[PDB]
Symmetry: C2
Subunit: 588 residues, 2 copies
């Protein structure tokens, strides 16, 4: 067998606590090299301490091959142990029938293994629920809607910035434009959100800042006055909550804006500033050489987000900064009852801070949702002591690549499988899936205005384990290239809205919330049934939901389903190129 392809990392996503007496264990092997895996497991102390002749290694537990990423196969088993201590090893058999035991001590013939020595085995030493990953259940039933507040709705012309342009969803906005969107506009259109069926709003930053996007924070403790005030934000959160809609705000803690009191004090007082060590300043005075691009300097004497001199990086290892940021994070939860924080550039802040943040939030709200913005693999933030989830850009990016280009269905299924096996099962269900955002081109533009393709992408994404999000205006087919063009004023004129797409998105949201969210502990299965043809199944003990996606260039015929939930062709059996069909069937 391919022994170099076999690996088990103890105390990780491959061995973790699910409840006081139960653990999940995984093994990686080389694809199709290993025929079978059994787990030998039990209480380490039982081997020598108990007077019985029975030994735990005499009754193996079968492991199941659950996924493959094209390189490796992944196997899993759930183990229950009342003594809440576990020693375990793997019996692996390859395609030629060669069997070995694999343990913390390496690879052995069974006859050579020291099975009576507890230290031979991998260990889960005591099942610690304080250390385990917990998923908040309310997120399961959520469909999110992301609002970039400058561009959603102007409900109050009297707070508009100087130079505000007329509201025109056909504009191509520049980087410094204002259209006057604000919190009253969101309040004004809560009926639209409830009619669409969404149950969570994600706001981009709303705190005082000079820009239209407000990531260059001036004051974290004040709603930007062009958006509203504290009273209005409280009214908005209560009105959302009354409609069953949770609220997630954007925490911009990696850097502060250069018009903040703190940075302005550094510019006035240099190293004598009380805030000098709140930042990462290499040489005083803190300076840079301006260029023709506001957002770029080649030589700032302080660390920044990217290379923009207007966003000095915060020193989150400084205990005064930790206290400042934790007080901000507490204030908005305690005084306004928000339900979640989305963490901007969360990977560039240290784990020590995020553990303190996690502890503070869970002490306020044990079901709080902490969402990190990270575009690469995120295992070390998703153990259960830092974030709940991340924005799942690697996963939706792979979906986009499949639908928009011409890779094989095998390639896509390999990539999604790889992703899921990076994380604990409950973590995968908390991941935040959005196909586009204020940082990407719009879906309808990526699809070259092919609405059928856009519907397929959205439906495929809405069938995945993670929770889906709709970027404002997707439901009417808004177009746009990348930032700033993906931030057009929301389309409120009916002549300019795609009503068919809105109707479709209402139906899709209903399949997600009424069917997919209501299965119990389901299994997801990816089947490649032909060239660019995929069958996705989610199933529990009672019911199976199946979606077939034909993204080749030929017609596909399927058996007429008894209960079709959603389809694009008028036929109940034939799928043309880029059609899909979702149905439900009982499990037999």
């Amino acid at each position: 067998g391919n022994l170099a392809g076999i690996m088990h990392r103890p105390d990780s996503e491959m061995a973790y606590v699910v409840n006081e007496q139960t653990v999940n264990i995984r093994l990686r092997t080389a694809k199709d090299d290993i025929v079978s895996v059994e787990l030998l497991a039990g209480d380490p102390y039982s081997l020598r301490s108990l007077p019985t002749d029975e030994k735990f290694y005499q009754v193996p537990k079968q492991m199941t091959k659950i996924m493959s990423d094209g390189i490796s196969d992944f196997w899993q088993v759930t183990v229950t142990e009342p003594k809440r201590r576990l020693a375990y090893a793997f019996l692996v058999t390859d395609m030629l029938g060669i069997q070995k035991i694999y343990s913390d001590k390496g690879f052995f013939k069974v006859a050579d293994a020291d099975l009576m020595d507890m230290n031979f085995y991998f260990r889960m030493p005591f099942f610690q629920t304080i250390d385990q990953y917990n998923a908040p259940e309310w997120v399961t039933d959520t469909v999110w809607y992301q609002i970039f507040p400058e561009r959603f709705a102007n409900g109050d012309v009297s707070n508009d910035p100087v130079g505000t342009k007329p509201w025109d969803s056909t504009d191509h906005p520049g980087r410094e434009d204002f259209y006057g969107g604000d919190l009253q506009g969101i309040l004004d259109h809560l009926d639209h959100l409830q009619e669409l069926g969404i149950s969570g709003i994600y706001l981009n930053p709303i705190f005082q800042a000079p820009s239209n996007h407000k990531y260059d924070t001036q004051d974290y403790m004040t709603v930007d006055p062009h958006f509203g005030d504290a009273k209005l934000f409280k009214q908005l959160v209560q009105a959302a909550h009354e409609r069953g809609i949770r609220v997630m705000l954007d925490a911009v803690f990696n850097h502060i804006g250069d018009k903040s009191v703190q940075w302005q004090d550094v510019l006035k007082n240099e190293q004598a500033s009380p805030y000098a060590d709140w930042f990462h300043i290499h040489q005083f005075p803190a300076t840079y050489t301006p260029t023709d691009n506001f957002e770029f300097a080649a030589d700032a004497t302080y660390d920044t987000f990217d290379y923009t001199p207007h966003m000095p990086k915060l020193n989150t290892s400084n205990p005064e900064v930790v206290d400042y940021l934790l007080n901000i994070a507490t204030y908005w939860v305690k005084e306004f009852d928000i339900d979640a924080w989305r963490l901007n550039v969360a990977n560039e802040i240290d784990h020590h801070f995020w553990r303190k943040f996690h502890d503070a939030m869970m002490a306020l709200k044990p079901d709080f949702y902490i969402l990190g913005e990270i575009w690469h693999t995120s295992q070390s933030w998703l153990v259960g002591d830092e974030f709940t989830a991340v924005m799942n850009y690697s996963y939706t990016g792979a979906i986009l690549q499949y639908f928009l280009e011409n890779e094989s269905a095998d390639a896509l299924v390999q990539k999604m499988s790889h992703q899921l096996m990076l994380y604990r099962d409950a973590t995968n269900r908390m991941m935040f899936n959005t196909v586009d955002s204020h940082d990407t081109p719009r879906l309808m533009t990526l699809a070259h205005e092919d609405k059928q393709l856009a519907k397929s992408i959205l439906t495929f994404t809405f069938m995945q384990p993670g929770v889906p999000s709709i970027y404002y205006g997707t439901e009417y087919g808004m177009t746009g290239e990348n930032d700033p063009d993906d931030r057009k004023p929301m389309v409120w004129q009916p002549e300019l809205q795609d009503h068919d797409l809105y109707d479709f998105m209402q139906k899709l949201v209903q399949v997600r919330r009424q069917v997919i969210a209501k299965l119990s502990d389901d299994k997801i299965i990816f089947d490649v049934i032909g060239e660019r043809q995929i069958r996705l199944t989610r199933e529990d003990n009672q019911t199976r939901i199946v979606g077939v996606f034909n993204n080749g260039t030929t017609d596909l015929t399927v058996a007429q389903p008894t209960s079709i939930l959603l389809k694009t062709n008028q036929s109940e059996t034939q799928l043309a190129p880029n059609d899909f069909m979702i149905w439900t069937e009982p499990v037999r």
Copy 2:
């Protein structure tokens, strides 16, 4: 190539911060399958943000194959980056010359890789020294001596337990025997320790407890009165410190003894006890059925260490228990200036507690040494936020197995290589290497009283990266089977001491402290030079120390070294079976 055998786990022992601008990166591949590995790495934002034509991926960095465990090869490189943000990927070429790029997105031909997208790469997002592993430098120069205080020296008959037996190192002690050893006895023999050359004392538990081993704690805040009192312990620590000897105490925090105030309160008051939730009680009253073995019950209604009813497990997730234990840990450091804590059964206490413990200790003493007793792989406790090191029983156990049985030298070198590549390089230098202890048979008994074999085992262990420890009496050749027989009264009668072994151990301690500890940033190399013949090299930029060990059944001839440090044969060129020779040479 064997792609299933290639793996890089970001933010782990394969990618970690060594200082503000420097990181160490590792890759695993299948043994001898990959010919070369280059790293492509640089600031993620530099790709699109900088106006230059240069891109970081145009100048690869060569990685070096540093170890092999017989299954996998391990490659390493050190990278410096002034922007303190790193994106990286690996260029791997197999034995047939097939080259691929391996990144967070998987495996690609170079021509197909999206090298301009920062999200293609693995990431070290910002170099966080607050999250990094730190090794205390004083441990580098230490050789430890482990004292089981009941059995080292009786310096005060007036505190002896009732039934104390006459001091006789030829006795076979029973599990409940007392010989009257105490803290005054240790004070009385500090000259012996200084003459041997040791610079750290590890004491087994000294707090009030009814047994001879005192792991069944009655009161953590009081020195056991058969050992001494607070004044005497302060005198002992100051006297040790005056001689350049650090002091490590045993923290028994996984369980408490059943004669403690807390457990006795549970027995009196059942669930109405203020301490009921300090424990893991499944059913009240807390009870068990006694057996003929004091240390075993089959049905205790509360969790215990092993199956002994006298050691109820502490609930370290309870904040009252956390506070109690942290106060104890603080008290002995603050009031008595101890230098380290050894943590008994440390794996069965939760990571949340150990992070709080770590933070508390480092705030008192930034160079504190935290040593966990764990007999299996310990990666998740050695990241830099919990322990400094563990008792390195997997490593010394492999050494013992080689010298005492007849496996190949390749097998041993594979096992040691596997061990070292589990951990960060600095961690490996902090590991605590003892060949025997109060929990194992004695070295001289394992060696069947073959003193030459015992000398080889000790010398081989003392050349390893971790810090060595001598269990009391090893230096005079004490014998003993496992506990309780490994706890004989210390041999103080000269007629019964092996003076040749004591002389040898003085010389060996001097090679460790004067030569091996004084190299700068050295490399360790394991060479198998013949059947059961091993050449161990440690070398820095100026000097190389080489040890050759002949453990076959034939003579071995080596070149006459110019500067021999330590050898067992009278010859300067010939090694008989089980001889060794250590020398030093300049690096050319």
